[PDB]
Symmetry: C3
Subunit: 225 residues, 3 copies
C-alpha cells in the first residue's frame, strides 16, 4: 500500500464519474461528491442586493451551511454573491472562444456588488470581514489546440487578467492549469491524473478563502416590496 | 427576471407549506427548510445544568452541528440552553392572552442558567465566550384584533420588555413585527409577503448571534449519577 | 421529569445499540449517532503527507465538514492525520495485552507528521494554527481483571505515558477512565451508565480540541505523480 496508489484509485473513480452544451453535469457531481462538505456545488445564477444577476454559471461552489438563502425559481438555482467561493465554465473542448466566454461569465460574477457589515461586540465594533476571493476557471475534457496545454492556450488565458481572470482549470485528457500570483503567469501541469490534480489545486486554494461575511440581508429584503 | 419575482415565488412556496393547538408543525417545517443549515428547528423543551426545564416550546431554533447533545425522551426533544438561538410560540390567532403566554414561555427559557467556560491556549487563557442572545417571538396566521397590527397588539407586546420580551413575530395574513432597540419600540411592517418578510428578519438577526460557547458539559454530566 | 431520567433513558438507548475481533462496529455506530455532527466516526487508517500510515484504527473521530479528503480504497477508509480528533481501540475484554496494543495503535497515529501552515491576511501573516491534541483510548465491554477498574488496569494504563498515552476509555460493564493532567494520574469512575459517562467525557474534552489547521495540501498532492 502507498499514498500514490490511493491517489491513482481516486482518479480512477473520478474518471468513471466524469466519463459542451451539457458537460457541466458531471463536473457538478464530481465536485459535490469530493469537495469538503462545507462547500456545495450547483449550476446556478448569482444575484446581488442591487438586483443584478450574473450569467448562468455552469458550476458554482458556494457555502453549504452559512449561505443565508438559495432561491429555487423556474427550475433554476440562484445564490447570493456573498456566499460564492468559485465559478467554472464547462464545455467538451477548450478553444479561444470558450476561454473568452469563461472569462466573460466569471467577470459577470465578480462585477456584482457584495456587501460586508461591521460586527458589534461588547467592547466596540470589529471591522467588516473581507470578501471571499472568488476563484474562476474552466473545465473541459479535450482541447482544440495541439499541443493542448501550450502557447496558444496560454495566450488565451492571458486575454483577461482582471475581472474575468481564470485562476485554475482542467483539460481532462491532458492536465491542469493555475495562475501563479508570484510570477504573475499561468503554470501548466501535464500528467495522467488531470481532474484529480485539479481537484487538489482547488481544495488547497479554498482553505485560504475565508468565510462568508456579515451580509446586508436587510438590503436584499427590500426587494420583498 | 427580477429579484422581486424571486422573492414573490419564494413566498408562494412558503404559503403552500404553511397552508392554535397544533399550528407549530408547519412553522417548524418552514424554518427547518429555509433557515441556513447551520440551524435546526424543532418542537422542544430546553434544559440547563441545574436540572431546570423551560416550558414546552413550539419552535426552538438551535445549533445543528455544535450542540453537545439532544435528548430524545418519551417522544419529546430536549435541548441544552447554551445551544439555543431562538424560541417561538405558535397559535392560529393573535390575542392578548396568546402574547402573554408567549412571553411567559420565552421567559422560561431565558431564566435558565447558561454556562460559558474560559478557553485555554498556549499563551494563556481567553475569556469565556458571550452567551447567545436568545430571540423570542410569536407566530400566528390571523389576529383577533382589528386592525391586526395596531395599537392593541403594540400594547400587548409592551407588556413584557425583559425576560419575556418578544423580539419578532409574524401574523401571516397581515405582516410582521420586530423590536427596534434604537428607538426602544416595536415596529410593524404590513405587506403581502408576511412569512417571508419575517424569515428575512430572523435570518438577518441570527447572523449576529455568535456561536455556541464552551459549555460546562461536566456540570451536565453530574446528573448521570 | 428530571434531568437524571433523561440521562438514564439515553443510557438505555445506548446499551441497546451496543448490545474482540469485530466489536468496533457498535462503538462506531454509537459515536456516529451521538457525537456532535461536526464530528464523524469510522474504522479507518490515518495517513500523512510523507506517505506514512498508521495501523488500522478501530474507531477514528475526524472532522466531518472541514477534512480536505477521505480516501476510499479496497473497502477501507483513509483519513489525513491533520483532521483527526481521537482514535480508539475496541475489543470485547480489557487485558494487559489489549492495553499495550491500544497504546501501540495510538502511537502509530501520533507519530505521523502533521502539517500546519501560516495564514496570510491583508495586514500580514497570522501564525500557523495549533495541531489538534489527538485523544487516544480503549473501548471494551468487560475486563479480564477482578476488580475490573483497579490496580492492575491502572498499572497497564501507566505503561505508556507518551506517544501511546490513552486519555480515556470505557469498560461497559463497570465504568470509565480518563487521564487527569493536573494530578498526572488515571481516574476511574465506577457507575451504572458507563458508556454514556464515557460519551460525556469525550464530548467535554472535544469542545476544547480546536479545529483543523491550514493543511499542506500541496505536499499531499505531490503523490499524484
Ligand atoms: Cl473576487
Ligand atoms: Cl438572552
Ligand atoms: Cl497529539
Ligand atoms: Mg458550458
Ligand atoms: Mg402554541
Ligand atoms: Mg479491536
Amino acid at each position: 500500500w502507498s499514498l500514490s496508489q490511493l491517489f491513482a484509485s481516486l482518479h480512477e473513480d473520478i474518471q468513471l464519474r466524469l466519463g459542451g452544451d451539457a458537460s457541466e453535469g458531471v463536473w457538478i457531481e464530481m465536485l459535490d461528491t469530493y469537495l469538503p462538505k462545507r462547500y456545495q456545488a450547483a449550476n446556478a445564477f448569482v444575484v446581488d442586493s442591487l438586483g443584478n444577476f450574473s450569467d448562468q454559471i455552469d458550476v458554482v461552489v458556494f457555502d453549504r451551511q452559512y449561505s443565508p438563502f438559495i432561491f429555487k425559481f423556474n427550475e433554476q438555482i440562484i445564490v447570493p454573491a456573498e456566499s460564492v467561493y468559485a465559478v467554472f465554465e464547462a464545455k467538451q473542448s477548450a478553444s479561444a472562444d470558450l476561454v473568452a466566454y469563461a472569462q466573460r461569465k466569471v467577470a459577470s460574477v465578480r462585477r456584482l456588488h457584495r456587501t460586508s457589515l461591521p460586527i458589534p461586540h461588547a467592547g466596540g465594533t470589529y471591522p467588516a470581514k473581507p470578501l471571499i476571493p472568488i476563484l474562476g476557471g474552466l473545465l473541459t475534457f479535450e482541447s482544440d489546440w495541439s499541443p493542448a496545454l501550450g502557447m496558444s492556450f496560454d495566450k488565451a488565458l492571458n486575454g483577461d487578467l482582471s475581472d474575468g481572470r481564470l485562476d485554475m482549470g482542467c483539460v481532462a485528457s491532458h492536465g491542469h492549469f493555475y495562475f501563479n500570483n508570484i510570477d504573475s503567469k499561468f503554470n501548466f501541469e501535464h500528467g495522467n491524473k488531470p481532474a484529480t490534480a485539479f481537484l487538489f489545486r482547488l481544495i488547497a486554494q479554498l482553505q485560504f478563502s475565508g468565510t462568508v461575511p456579515m451580509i446586508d440581508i436587510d438590503a436584499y429584503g427590500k426587494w420583498l416590496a
